[PDB]
């Protein structure tokens, strides 16, 4: 049960907000999927300038 290694690859990583394993943003350690990050981008401190 859960014997297969999960040390690397998409299976090991999941979104910290929703748990989905797709489109994870690993830059700067965000560990959030692209959909969740855009929703929470303003709160995290990211802003759109140009």
């Amino acid at each position: 049960w859960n014997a297969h290694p999960k040390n690397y690859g998409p299976g090991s990583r999941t979104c910290r907000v929703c748990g989905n394993p797709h489109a994870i943003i690993r830059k700067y350690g965000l560990m959030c999927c692209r959909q969740c990050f855009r929703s929470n981008a303003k709160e995290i401190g990211f802003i759109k300038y140009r």
């Binding site: 692209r34 990050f37 990211f46 802003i47 759109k48 300038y49």
Partner: protein, 104 residues
Amino acid sequence: MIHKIRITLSSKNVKNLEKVCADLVRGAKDKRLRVKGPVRMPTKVLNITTRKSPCGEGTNTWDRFELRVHKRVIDLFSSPDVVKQITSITIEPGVEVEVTIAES
């Protein structure tokens, strides 16, 4: 007796960061201490570019997200106790104050 103490300030808000820097420099000039700074490091621009659409349909539009980090460095020539007194003042929100003894 006199040591070169380095104070590093980081913040996302320029006005708050500049306000604290002025207070520390102005707070040290009152004690007639030698002050080197503030020295403004190049601004760090964290950038995240992501697809706007939650799906893949439509024109491929992108949002460019920026989180700018401003860093200031101030060097004070005085004992740690005097520097501790100056930095003990209340700091504005979002400004991170880090006091370390310069290794020279």
